Design a protein around this ligand. Structure first.
Ligand SMILES: CNc1nccc(-c2cccnc2Oc2c(C)cc(Nc3nc4ccccc4[nH]3)c3ccccc23)n1
Length: 328
């Protein structure tokens, strides 16, 4: 065989022989770290089991495999390999995706104290990869720290492409997503802001069981929004939103007090006021008054790094995915 099988928990990994010493990693698809004998480096390998098995898993796999092909930027995932060990379409079950092994995801980086050089630099790279997607027509709309990974040198990559045009973690989705609104590119600034605020506060900013709950955590930290905002709502969401129990909401100093920041030197004191300025501009309900990607990249906190630089059947999904895999 070109391949070999190995038990890793309950699933079997069956992979190119070039992949050795599989170790289960991260939160799960099952992903294993492995040594690539051929490239002589470490990789992470994800097993998709029968991705074509329902229209949801299938649309997203298909979509993400087509989009990876396209895209090419250091802040955005690239596959080193895509393979299946099954030899025919009729036999086809599993797709394996191989990428460079990184050091940690951003959920773990969040738990740490980070200085301003590292926090601005992570945020800078997130904004570079978002610019890049938007350049290729992709508006992510579901950025979240579990899909973002980091190296020890603080280099960052975003690993997914978000929603299409059609327990899942909803805490980082923009009001325009939460509310059915219509959106533009700066929808993803709102997710950068949730992430930025949780690196500062070390706790999820807008939690809840459902969107109801999430909305309430939002308006009561930030205040009920207003007029121009509402009329871009559909009358029935406008109705639930307009008859919501009201908040004045907190200013950003109360929301993000100094005690959270490095504040020992004059450099740090300044950096902390810059950081709060950015937060204040990213975590803005109405996307009309929310900062864009370009302007965020020009923000003084950020710019120190600046560098110019259909519906298918199962059977139908399987052939499409199979073909992307084989490239045919
Ligand atoms: C600790 N170091 C480290 N290094 C690299 C990866 C991970 C990691 C750990 C546990 C869970 N997932 C992880 O990574 C991934 C994520 C989060 C998302 C992806 N996106 C994706 N794109 C798909 C397209 C179709 C189907 C599934 C997909 N899954 C990955 C694709 C490939 C390989 C890893 C991915 N961890």
């Amino acid at each position: 065989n070109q391949f070999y099988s190995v038990e890793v928990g309950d699933s079997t990994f069956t992979v190119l022989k070039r992949y050795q010493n599989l170790k289960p990693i991260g939160s799960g698809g099952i992903v294993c770290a492995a040594y690539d004998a051929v490239l002589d480096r470490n990789v992470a390998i994800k097993k998709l089991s029968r991705p074509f098995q329902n229209q949801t898993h299938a649309k997203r796999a298909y979509r993400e495999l087509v989009l990876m092909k396209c895209v090419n930027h250091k802040n955005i995932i690239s596959l080193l390999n895509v393979f299946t060990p099954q030899k025919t379409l009729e036999e086809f079950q599993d797709v394996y995706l191989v990428m460079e092994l990184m050091d940690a995801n951003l959920c773990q980086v969040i738990q740490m104290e980070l200085d301003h050089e590292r926090m601005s630099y992570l945020l800078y790279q997130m904004l570079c990869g978002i610019k890049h997607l938007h350049s290729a027509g992709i508006i992510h709309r579901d950025l979240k720290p579990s899909n973002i990974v980091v190296k020890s040198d603080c280099t960052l990559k975003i690993l997914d492409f978000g929603l299409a045009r059609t327990v899942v973690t909803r805490y980082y989705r923009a009001p325009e997503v939460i509310l059915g609104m219509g959106y533009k590119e700066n929808v993803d600034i709102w997710s950068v802001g949730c992430i930025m605020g949780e690196m500062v506060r070390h706790k999820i900013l807008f939690p809840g069981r459902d969107y109801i709950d999430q909305w309430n955590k939002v308006i009561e930290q930030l205040g009920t929004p207003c007029p121009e905002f509402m009329k871009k709502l559909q009358p029935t969401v406008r109705n639930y939103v307009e008859n919501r129990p009201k908040y004045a909401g907190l200013t950003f100093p109360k929301l993000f007090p100094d005690s959270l920041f490095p504040a020992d030197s004059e450099h740090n004191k300044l950096k902390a006021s810059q950081a709060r300025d950015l937060l204040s501009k990213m975590l803005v309900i109405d996307p009309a008054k929310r900062i864009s990607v370009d302007d965020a990249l020009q923000h003084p906190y950020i710019n120190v790094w600046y560098d110019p630089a259909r519906e298918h059947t199962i059977e139908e999904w399987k052939e499409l995915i199979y073909k992307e895999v084989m490239n045919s």
